[PDB]
Amino acid sequence: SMSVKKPKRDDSKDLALCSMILTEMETHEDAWPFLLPVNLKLVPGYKKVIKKPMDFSTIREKLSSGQYPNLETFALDVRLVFDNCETFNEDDSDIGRAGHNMRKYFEKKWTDTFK
Numbered sequence: 001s002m003s004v005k006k007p008k009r010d011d012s013k014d015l016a017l018c019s020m021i022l023t024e025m026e027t028h029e030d031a032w033p034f035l036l037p038v039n040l041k042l043v044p045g046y047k048k049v050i051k052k053p054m055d056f057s058t059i060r061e062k063l064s065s066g067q068y069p070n071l072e073t074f075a076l077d078v079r080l081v082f083d084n085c086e087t088f089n090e091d092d093s094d095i096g097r098a099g100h101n102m103r104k105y106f107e108k109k110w111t112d113t114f115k
Contacts, residue, residue: 014071018063021109025078026056028105030098034081050087054080071114078106 025031037055040047059077061067068074085099 011071015063017113018068018071018074021106021113022056022060022063022078024109025102025106026060028102030101031056033085033095033098034102046088050084052080052084054084056081075110079103082106 026035034056036057038046038050038053040053046053054077059074059081062077063074068077082099082103085095089096089099091097091100
C-alpha cells in the first residue's frame with residue numbers, strides 16, 4: 001500500500017531474456033504455422049472467428065519497439081498464439097499438433113527462466 005512495498009525483484013534482464021526465448025521459439029522446427037500473420041484474405045473464417053490474431057513476427061516487432069510493459073504481457077501474447085491455433089485447428093492435424101508442441105516448449109522455457 002502507500003509507502004509499503006515488497007522487496008524489488010530485478011526485472012532489468014527481462015527484455016533480453018524474453019528475446020532469447022522468442023529466438024528459440026522462432027528457430028523450432030514446428031514454428032512454421034506461427035512465424036507470420038495468418039493471411040485474412042486467403043483463409044476463410046479466420047477474420048471473423050479469431051478476434052485477436054497473433055504470431056511470432058508481430059510479437060518480435062512489439063518486443064523490439066517497447067510495446068510490452070512487463071514480462072507477463074509478453075507471455076499473454078505468446079499464449080494467444082497457441083489459444084488461437086487450438087480454436088481454429090483440429091488437435092489431429094499437423095498445425096494442431098505443432099501448436100501443442102510449441103506451447104509445451106514455451107512453458108518449460110518460461111518456468112526455467114523466471115520461476
